[PDB]
Design a protein around this nucleic acid. Sequence first.
DNA 1: TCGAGAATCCCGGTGCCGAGGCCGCTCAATTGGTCGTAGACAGCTCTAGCACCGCTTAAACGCACGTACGCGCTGTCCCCCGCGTTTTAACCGCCAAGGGGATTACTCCCTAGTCTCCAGGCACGTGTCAGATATATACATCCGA
DNA 2: TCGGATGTATATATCTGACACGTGCCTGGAGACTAGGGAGTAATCCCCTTGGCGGTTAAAACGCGGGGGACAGCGCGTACGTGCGTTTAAGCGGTGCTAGAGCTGTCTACGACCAATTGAGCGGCCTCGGCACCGGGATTCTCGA
Lengths: 80, 80, 91, 91, 134, 94, 94, 107, 107
Amino acid sequence: RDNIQGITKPAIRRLARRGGVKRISGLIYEETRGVLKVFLENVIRDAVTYTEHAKRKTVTAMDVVYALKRQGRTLYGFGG
Amino acid sequence: RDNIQGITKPAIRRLARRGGVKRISGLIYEETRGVLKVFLENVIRDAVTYTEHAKRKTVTAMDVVYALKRQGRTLYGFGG
Amino acid sequence: QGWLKEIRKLQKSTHLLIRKLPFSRLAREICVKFTRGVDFNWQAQALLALQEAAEAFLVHLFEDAYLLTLHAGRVTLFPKDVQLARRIRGL
Amino acid sequence: QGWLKEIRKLQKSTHLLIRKLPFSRLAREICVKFTRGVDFNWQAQALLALQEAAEAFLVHLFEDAYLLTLHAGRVTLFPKDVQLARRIRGL
Amino acid sequence: MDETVAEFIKRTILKIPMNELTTILKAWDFLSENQLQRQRKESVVQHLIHLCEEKRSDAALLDIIYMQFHQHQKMKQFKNSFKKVTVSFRETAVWIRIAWGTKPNQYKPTYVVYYSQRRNTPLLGQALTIASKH
Amino acid sequence: RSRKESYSIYVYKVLKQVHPDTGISSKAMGIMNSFVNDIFERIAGEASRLAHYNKRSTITSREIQTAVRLLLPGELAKHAVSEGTKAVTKYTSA
Amino acid sequence: RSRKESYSIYVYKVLKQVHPDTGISSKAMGIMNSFVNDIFERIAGEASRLAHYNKRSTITSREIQTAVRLLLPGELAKHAVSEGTKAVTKYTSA
Amino acid sequence: RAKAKTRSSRAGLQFPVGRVHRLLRKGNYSERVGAGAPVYLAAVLEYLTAEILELAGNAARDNKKTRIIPRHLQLAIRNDEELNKLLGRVTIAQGGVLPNIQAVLLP
Amino acid sequence: RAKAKTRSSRAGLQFPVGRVHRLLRKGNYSERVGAGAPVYLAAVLEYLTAEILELAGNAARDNKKTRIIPRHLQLAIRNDEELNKLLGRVTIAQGGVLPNIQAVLLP
DNA sequence: TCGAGAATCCCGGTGCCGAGGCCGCTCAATTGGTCGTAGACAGCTCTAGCACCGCTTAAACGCACGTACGCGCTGTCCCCCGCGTTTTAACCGCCAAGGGGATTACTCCCTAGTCTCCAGGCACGTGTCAGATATATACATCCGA
DNA sequence: TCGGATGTATATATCTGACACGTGCCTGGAGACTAGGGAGTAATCCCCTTGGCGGTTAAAACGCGGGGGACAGCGCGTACGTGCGTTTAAGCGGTGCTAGAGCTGTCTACGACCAATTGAGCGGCCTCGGCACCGGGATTCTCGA
């Protein structure tokens, strides 16, 4: 009944099989949730700042890309 | 009688002792000259472009900092 | 046995891996802990931006991490392999 | 024995390590291989900018590399430890 | 919390119109009378929120008066018993307002149903029509 | 009434010009729309500095010719430094 | 003759104000001179984008606030915005 | 009173000069904008788009498809060296990764 | 015909308003510059310089010196966490590094 | 463990050069006053987004699993460290010359700017087909038997 | 270690949802011209780099011989991957609703510009003194029993 436990063990394994990982230890499932939670807190912090600057109550796709722009990971495909 | 052999073995070791390196293998002295030579060719290429833009024949300190600015390693202490 | 089939299958396709509805509940809960917790609406296009950017971060993260597993004479990955790879990246 | 004295001595001070006159001949030779090789004058202040930026790059490089030596169960560093650390950095 | 109280307070003052800002804010008496001491609407909330540090579920009652000045966007212990914001009554024209329905979420649209004689909609009608003796 | 614009027509013209029968998905236009704006921003943003660095006020052809000289790896730059130079003389002809 | 400017006299006030006895070398002023420009770059360079992002063409005090909210990390930012907000109220005090 | 001849047509290019020349002033890059600048710039933009689509079609052609999917862009950039040196920081939505099994995992 | 009262003095700050307000127009950041902007900005600049010098003096004080050397700045930034999160990309000339012996190299 | 062991650090020298402070001064900052306009502000409105419920069925959870796999293990041994002595060149100063960076007065050509036409683009519209998933019939590759 | 079952593959089929292309239009690029100001060009002043010697002195290369590390190899033991029967929650549609996104329309507060009008601020100029460095020398140090 926790949202961070909404990232199942095989779903984490689905990521690592794409990364070319043969065999995964059992303590990864705690660390990967920790790494993912920090990575969102460095974006949702930044994405909501644009959302509250232009005085709205709704995040747009451009809000995320702007947050990822200064973050240093530019994401194409959505744009203006 | 080569300038890249102007970087002696103890001078390379002086760098790694500052980096907290206990014991160094013997094949490092070829690789470190290779790494250093590439790092200058990604800067002197860029630094001379500013030097040839403002139509001069002399590199300034601001020319290097501008090259290191776009390189992503900002160096303070010299400035304008 | 099968895992090598599993790697070539997932590196073939390009669809998302984390399921959207648990991923949506995660991002909305993090947004509550900012802006003093009112709420925020999300464009359904905009939540797909995270779910792209989260997986593309992590898949790129493990490839940097799994090199350290093979460098250590190991095959099985470890959390030591994760945090060190995060440390050398510098963020 | 002495090397630990050598580490604390060099991490104490802050002066440059590579000697200037061989370092000057290196940078001038690289500048010849651009701008079709005429020559370029160098401000003596400006060559110190490289000699700061070169050492600050490499000293930061080995600290990232020497972590991989200890991660591999080793103490003696290797060129394998160098190129892998350069690879994960992404430049 | 007091931040989240201020966030409900900051959004409430911004939602009201400045042609009637001083009218309805005087009707709440959330601050004191003479403490209202005019130029810029965004700056006026920047001082009144810092002026809300004096008097500090503490400030939602101003919004129930805000539904009276904007009524186009839609014993008496027979509502507070349902505690499984909370209910925020106000006297009136013999009736009351509710501003009640929410876990804690008081910045969402709570229901409003007077008595002049989401999933929480399935049970908020059950606790009302208690049919007491009055 | 929401009269927006993009580079949607121009990418499809270039693709048709150098490939006869090759189509493109509407998701892939969102790549190329986000692609060319990020290149445009980095080029014009960098060449904005060289005017400010060398104290002049006028972005001309010469700044871009040294901006593309910096923003690309050099082998790809060897054609790009000559492509616009092939084109900029052609405009001043007519 | 030429004339060149810095921030050095202003910083030497600040150092004297936080410590009535601590002095500073010549080289460390060049550290601080290159420091405060690079902070002035990244704040205004970010704050210029938000004017471009939300289509209003006027950098006001509000856009600096959200840019400092973006650039500085979450703990150090909380004082500087308060140090910022304290400044403008005293400026509008007279 | 002549006919409106497009500067992009006069340059013989494909990307719009007049849109770039409008954007380059309003993007607040400098005060004065030279005439030769946004006609030199569009060719640089045209050479890049013609570069990566020419690799993208070969990804489409080899995978038996006449319609470029976004993954074919991802396979085009990472198989090139020099574009990967340009776009190694930038990710791509619906891109996936290279089919990269690391070397020593085999019988 | 009054006396020239400095806006920096009127703000009660230390960093020059009038120099920043001149630079913020000529740096070509936007078209219009608000009055409240380069008086909000100087306080942000003042708070940062007052932050790092206050750590720099303690590096000077502990190393028995009344004159701040540039290494004391380097020891101040890397010993702070949050400034290191700001300045981790930026190096410092004549800085050196932390006295960082890695852990397991000891008897 | 002991002991003398150099080793560590501290302290009171000369001393230099350099920041700290004071001095003419100018030009950029501020003051005073005028304008338009961006943008604030409030007001409609219809699009997109949250909620909910049902039915799903594919997905996950646990688990028993044996079977690979980390790893501590010890022995081996090539390969750095330290030391010492003998070349080698970086270095400081010094000097002399001079290309070459900064500055200055110069004119005009490029570029903003205006305002006056027009059409290339945009949004919108139906045809239809690539392709994709669908199911096969058909062709090859080695997994445990 | 061959059979062989398990994996591979064009082929086909339909079906479809995207998309390429027609169309009306309309806001924006273009034409043509106007002034004025950037900036290019040209000429000059000395600043600073360059390239000399001498010669000095720490640096560095040679070479060893020591042992400390790397490492190949092997023991167990253990944690994770695979099947698999059992939950279960994601998804999808699906419907009902609306709160906010966004757009348009007045009002004005607020910045730009301009012109005077001082003083804060910048280069010289000098003088003090903090750091710097030598060695006494008072601590605080390391393996023969």
